[PDB]
């Protein structure tokens, strides 16, 4: 009798829904007099209304019916809200369950608690209008639309007993990222992962337009979700007396199908991909709000999206409508004299960690277990002599990540947009494979690396991969994201959203435990351009990330393979950060052995003694590099200057942790003035070679005592199909251009360096001509090794 | 008999396809000996192979069959290529048609022309590996995937006789932007617009993984495209002798259905949304290439994506396979002794502007007609006294765009993500409406503003709107894009792609005519936060645009409504630029009348005489602003300083064209040192108030003679739910913080300004406290007017 809804049971469910709707309206409008004991006066009304109403009745309607199944079936549910502007609905249900009073004791169940609960919403010094980290039971705010469903599937990974109910706005379903994320059911393994129950809140409008999903035919809407791989169930209507029974029947059927799917998969019976149930809920927008305002239809219209009436403070006619709207929920029957919800409502609230707002999954940092990291020195390459041996930079990292996967079989995942093979991380395929629940063919057995239980997620949507990983981290797990630097601008908005979530959680919300870091590896750079990737690719993603402070993000540019291992090992232990690691995958010179790499990465920035020439003396010039390809040209420029100017003293500095250039006043992570002046002197020229836009170095280190001697050479522009040396010449980061820059900058080389400067320009001409004749660089350039 | 393919006609079509495939392989591999007259030696082979092979046979297969219908039905087709890495297929077919020889006379039809044609591809000093602007008949490079389909619909707008054939790679179909762009058929009016014939190139793989669209069941794939609103036709096979007739039949059926749809709609017989035909083409990847390499399957596998053999240069065995691969196309039967294609191939080539590569639509700048712009002074607000009257800033712009739409009924469109009403541009609804082909209800007659022939495009996907507009401009039309600044990070990648296209077209490609500018209006700013928009919204899009230099991008921050009209009028006449206009929509003070606004916008930056105090004297301080909200605080700070320091002389400077801060050496648009020193003195402090990150002003004007006196205040962090004055206080751009900044910077106020500085701090405390207890600012702040 789980499907059938008792008339006695329906009354309590309906009463809860009215109470949830009443509190939603109170949060938007009222700042005083929560229960209308006295007549509603304009001094009780908020000024500058900012909350949204249209989506709230639908969100609360789903919430109360999900609570019914939790009590009856002991389900482990969480609630992911697509329309984040419907935050007051989520807070209202959290308050009714008692979760909000536990987390925030100032908002008690009493009347005085309701004064604070209403006053705080969308108010200065209170809380926001979206599902911010302050919201209990929230892993995602719907401020930026299109990422809700990918977050739902990210939370369901490796959570076999968890069912994630994702409510999706119909306008949000028009966005790019959301349309693709429907296909995430081809990467969800029913045997080992949880289930996502997507609910399409098809209220027909978004802000001022009808939504295209609502205005297509019912047959097209059904065919669309069959094509996405779902089994759609439609709950449509406008009468709550009818929709309560329909919604209860539909949700019960969906949960039974979900549990039947998981039971079949976990017995080794139906290992093929199933058709997951989904619900299309078609209800009026502003369902229980005012019917008409100023003669225009408001309920079931786009006019109820923000507020049915925004001028209640000015004219008494709309103030009376607001009071009539509030009294239509009959609050006298819902709250007792003390202000607490009546015992009828208390009986149907779930208990403990079953409440969808006290669920520990939504505060995943509490469930987080540190990774069992193997010693990365086992994968370290052998560097007997710095700058003389060649090795693939990312191949040791793949072997290291292979051992992380082996030792963390359910805690760690690797995310990549069909570039794991391209990024030369194939070593992870020796222990695991790529998850694939779609159809398989015998041709995939050769080198496909596909299985239903792979630890590597592979889909071409950068939005979907980022959504999966962000929710995977926020639910207490660990991950690693590997992609090309060219396609990093695609996830600019998603990274900004996650950076805001981490920053608010760490500073403003005390009860949210720290989660694992978002580790992004940009495995192919803009200097060693390969077959894939557009021509004018730029390192603009580094600049965008740096806009956020060192408080929440870090940039690492390891110069070789052993430094990449140390950086990856350190970042797999950090918690509240967005770690961006830039490392090219081409065969490169190796500089530091395992022990030197660990020391160098711990310092973030240091002097390379083997490449330096100024031991026990003041250097004539400081040559600094940041980036593997950039570092090679700086070293080659150093070797050229040592051969032609034997008396020239050069100090070589390598920067790995880019944010250490900022002064320690701006952030504790940065170098102090004494430390900065010890590395880069107080008066000598600094020739800084940078992998990225040169202006960024200036932005970070303008408050230094020697900023007037900081010369930065970096990315400017990319012409089509430059050879690696030709591209460096165009941007003037080449060995020859750097040597020319040193000759210009060093005061005592401005006359004696003229003949060398002319010879360097001849070399630039010769190599450019050879690149046009052959399409490749000379063997001497490709096989260059550090002399001395 | 158009559907049936003659055996004689099939032979020529097959011969053309082999010739196209032969030239694709030659472009990837050969740099000499185009027709194998002598044995293939390793010196004929390119070094650093960069072209892609897997997608080429499918692209050429579609191309030759489209040419058949052009010759038979006289269709006006263009070819939009999703897999841009399959560029050598497009160039090969352009060469066979003779288009490439006309555009590039160095690559003639002869054997000598083939030496240059093969040598240039993916070569330094040649052409790129994607469909760059150098490619004839290309409006879109498939470097960044996901935008091909939205570009196809943008080209079809207002082009009733045009059919756009868009080939979509199955890997590309997994991306976010492409998944939602299928719904563009709900905005494409059959009576007035063209038709898009999407062809899904379902070769089963993308780079190293099977595509999810290929591995779902046929019933799911069919249901997916029915749900998208299409009528899918499946062309599946691997034998070309059989697939040639199937493809010819399917394309003929699709075109007849398209013309039947347009004929029914243009007679007023049925104005309902039709089911547009689409084609699913399932062919092996690397279709005619080597079957197996090193014992692994290559044809019909992901291993053929880049190159079946990447080692032909080293070992002779692979070199022999390459020659056997080339001879499998039988080039002795396809090219004449002189190297021209045989007369059999010449017969089936289209003639003139029907060739899909000589189609003038793809070089839309040739078809561009300048807009009939009305005089914007008719919409100008009345400003009898600067800084005293108030008006909505964007409403005059809406009335101006209303008249632009009226005078350009088929040449101009407005694009917005359901924010036209929010951005207060409702005036455009007085002449036109929003295009909507979905189901309509009588409730839409009140304020829906929906019709099948609206000039305003309204979908919630920012990716789709940007794709529509970019192709609309590249085909020679005009448009205006209005959105929120908060959601501008969504289109970062798309704007980067369009910036590359404009920059290469203007500089490197001589035959491409200039197209209209991409005019982006960010109608809601981060300083006036409203109901919509997430908590932590930042002006980072301005920074990303400025990475592209002044050659291709311009940033305008008009201070009031009349300046917005002048900026919008000027930008509707510019051609090869990305114009970003930042203008808040809230009710603001008005400063310049119609004539003064036109003069100020022409200069880009100037001294406001009415707000200045230093006439005939050296100013003590220069107060500069850039942005409407920022300008208000700068003026209020100026008024405060005038009241408390009657002897203080203040020069007020307003910046509208942001790039004029750059020196004229960097770009001719920038101010010279003489002009910059006349506005901002050579030795006085400059208090610069900026709408955006302060570091950007430093980046633009670091090399100025008075940069040591430039003190910039801008956006730092928006926090959550701050009142407008409170948000300015947090970022220290408020009137009180600016006045404090002036007191510190001016040398003779450092002692006499101490008591005023304490009073200013007391005001900051008072307004913050009032904002916490009321949620709104004081009426004195809200109703502030310029005194004097
Ligand atoms: N003080 C500064 N503030 C902001 N950006 C700067 C500054 N100095 C240089 N830049 C930017 O960084 C790049 C390189 O400048 P810089 O690091 O000074 O090298 P440089 O060789 O000294 N060139 P210049 O300073 O013009 O003689 C340029 O493209 C500038 O846009
Ligand atoms: N070369 C530069 N000089 C000054 N500021 C810079 C430079 N490059 C970037 N900036 C940025 O500009 C912002 C604004 O600083 P600024 O305009 O100098 O104001 P200010 O009052 O002078 N503060 P300060 O310069 O540190 O004493 C800083 O926070 C930096 O992030
Ligand atoms: C990409 C994007 N564009 C625009 C917005 C602005 N916005 C916020 S809420 C909203 C309405 C869409 O709501 P819908 O998904 O229809 O939800 P419902 O009202 O049915 O809950 C819009 C356009 C946004 N958040 N994200
Ligand atoms: C968003 C994005 N991610 C990654 C890439 C890298 N890339 C370039 S070509 C390509 C293959 C796409 O496969 P598909 O569209 O099926 O092409 P086809 O099989 O026809 O070659 C990929 C992933 C890209 N261009 N865009
Ligand atoms: Mg909606
Ligand atoms: Mg493919």
Numbering used by the authors:
A (entry chain B), B (entry chain A): 9 to 796
Pull text from the paper.
It converts F6P, xylulose-5-phosphate (Xu5P) or sedoheptulose-7-phosphate (S7P), which are intermediates in RuBP regeneration, to produce acetyl phosphate (AcP) and C3, C4 or C5 sugar phosphates. XPK is an enzyme present in many microorganisms, primarily involved in substrate-level phosphorylation to produce AcP.
Given the importance of the physiological role of SeXPK, we solved the cryo-EM structures of SeXPK, both free (with coenzyme TPP/Mg2+ bound) and complexed with the non-hydrolyzable ATP analog, AMPPNP. In contrast to the published XPK structures from Lactococcus lactis and B. breve/longum, which exist as dimers in crystals, the cryo-EM structure of SeXPK is a dodecamer composed of six dimeric units, forming a circular donut-shaped array both for the AMPPNP-bound form and in the absence of AMPPNP. Comparison between the free and bound dimers in the same orientation shows that the two subunits jointly bind two AMPPNP. The key residues, H706 and Y710 from reciprocal subunits (helix α24 based on Supplementary Fig. 3), sandwich AMPPNP in the dimer interface by forming π–π stacking interactions with the adenine ring of AMPPNP. The α- and β-phosphate groups of AMPPNP are stabilized by H706, H719, R721 and R753 and the γ-phosphate group by R711 from the reciprocal subunit. Instead, the negative charges of PPNP are mainly stabilized by the positive charges of the adjacent Arg and His residues. Another notable residue involved in the binding of ATP is R711, which forms a salt bridge with the γ-phosphate of ATP and explains the lack of inhibition by ADP. Nonetheless, ATP binding to the allosteric site could cause conformational change of active site residues through a pathway of local conformational changes involving three structurally observable steps, as summarized in Fig. 6f and detailed in Fig. 6g–n and Extended Data Fig. 5b–d, with further explanation by stereo views in Extended Data Fig. 7 showing important roles of P702–W703 in these conformational steps.
